[PDB]
């Protein structure tokens, strides 16, 4: 269990463009979440909490200033809206709503945007304006298998937001389907552990990771405990966190602990250049694990 004392530096005043605001918003949001879940608030000063909620809220508001008339986000208003960033924002808010109330029109508009504008007939989500801060997108930064990876990223957001936006966005169940579709077809062909992981969780949430697919996923793990590639410690942490989440979704608790172990054993506590995805995923994953710890 990553110790609250070693995390102080994740409560961060969120400043900047539609990206840096999210960069600074990410760690705070996920940290409060961790402490909430792992109960560690008394250890680390109850009164610091109200403090960070306002901080989060601040992030949230500030972000809204970058929302376009389409209900999608780019770094600034002048810029072409970003498929990834929009997806990322939804992802974060969906988690944030556990802590702060949100405006569901903001979020549901964002989703309806991704669906009707950026999903292909075949079911992939297409990126038209790559995010300036390429480092924040985690493992998607790698070119290879990009359709599949970006499609997984969006899906994971749309599922994470599914339960809020279902009545408002009438195309949403269709989209989830059409994406998961696509992921099934190309899943057997994946090369990167990274992609196997993200897409895995994407399809795990969908009860679609089974038979030879579940097999591909599990056997991709190096040492039955981590999803790695010659890239970076961070990709791998990210990749693994997804994988952990995926395992939780299948409920193969019999295979989980050596994974958690590894994640725990990384001496990594969020924060830094490129850290956004690795931070958000690893504490999301780990907390889910606590909730579900039998």
């Amino acid at each position: 269990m990553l110790d609250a004392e070693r995390l102080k530096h994740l409560i961060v005043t969120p400043s900047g463009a539609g990206e840096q605001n999210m960069i600074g918003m990410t760690p705070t949001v996920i940290a409060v979440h961790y402490l909430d879940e792992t109960e560690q608030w008394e250890k680390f000063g109850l009164e610091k909490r109200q403090g960070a909620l306002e901080l989060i809220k601040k992030g949230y508001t500030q972000q809204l200033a970058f929302r376009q008339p389409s209900s999608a986000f780019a770094a600034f208003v002048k810029r072409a809206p970003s498929t990834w960033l929009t997806a990322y924002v939804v992802k974060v808010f969906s988690l944030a709503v556990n802590l702060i109330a949100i405006d569901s029109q903001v979020l549901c508009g964002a989703v309806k945007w991704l669906i009707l504008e950026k999903q292909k007939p075949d079911g992939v989500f297409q990126e038209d304006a790559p995010v300036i801060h390429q480092e924040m997108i985690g493992g998607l930064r790698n070119n290879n298998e990009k359709d599949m990876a970006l499609t997984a990223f969006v899906l994971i957001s749309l599922q994470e937001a599914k339960d809020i936006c279902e009545e408002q966005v009438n195309s949403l169940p269709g989209s989830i389907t059409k994406a998961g579709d696509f992921l099934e077809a190309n899943y057997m062909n994946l090369q990167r552990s990274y992609t196997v992981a993200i897409a895995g969780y994407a399809l795990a949430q969908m009860g679609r990771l089974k038979g030879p697919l579940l097999n591909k996923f599990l056997t991709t793990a190096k040492d039955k405990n981590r999803w790695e590639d010659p890239g970076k410690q961070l990709y791998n942490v990210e990749a693994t966190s997804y994988a952990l989440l995926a395992l939780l979704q299948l409920k193969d608790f019999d295979f989980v602990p050596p994974v958690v172990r590894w994640l725990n054993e990384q001496r990594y506590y969020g924060g830094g250049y490129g850290s956004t995805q690795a931070t958000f995923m690893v504490f999301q994953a780990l907390a889910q694990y606590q909730k579900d710890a039998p």
Binding site: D36, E37, E39, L53, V97, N98, L99, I100, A101, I102, D103, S104, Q105, L107, D163, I164, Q205, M206, G207, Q249, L250, K251, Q290, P294
Partner: protein, 130 residues
């Protein structure tokens, strides 16, 4: 603008931190404390049916203390199939349903394994012909 009352409290849980007035279209989630399980839909939003006073769209979930020995039977809806939902059903787990072509759904689409090995908090949903 149009605005909701307070959300149901949840015993042994938490609610997102908002601040009044609550505007229409506001989500809040509910979670349960470390060793309690959430039973029932977790998100609630403020909506307007009459287009004059806002009201919350579903009941609050409630926390049940986690029973480690709890398990429910495989739940079946005549006329629908289970979409999301992975067996074995231990305490707190959920399942969602869709009706088959030529069936309308009448009821809440998801159920939770209650500590008493029955599915709640509603009745299982009903699918009906056309």
């Amino acid at each position: 603008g149009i605005s909701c009352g307070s959300p149901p409290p949840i015993l042994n849980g938490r609610i997102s931190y908002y601040s009044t007035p609550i505007a229409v279209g506001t989500v809040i989630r509910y979670s349960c404390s470390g060793t309690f399980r959430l039973i029932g839909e977790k998100s609630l939003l403020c909506i307007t049916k009459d287009k004059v006073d806002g009201t919350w769209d579903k009941p609050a979930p409630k926390c049940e203390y986690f029973n480690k020995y709890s398990s429910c039977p495989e739940p079946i809806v005549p006329g629908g199939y289970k979409i999301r939902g992975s067996t074995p059903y231990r305490h707190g787990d959920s399942v969602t349903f869709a009706c088959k072509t030529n069936f309308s759904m009448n009821g809440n689409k998801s159920v939770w394994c209650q500590a008493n090995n029955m599915w709640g908090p509603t009745r299982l949903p009903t699918c009906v012909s056309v």
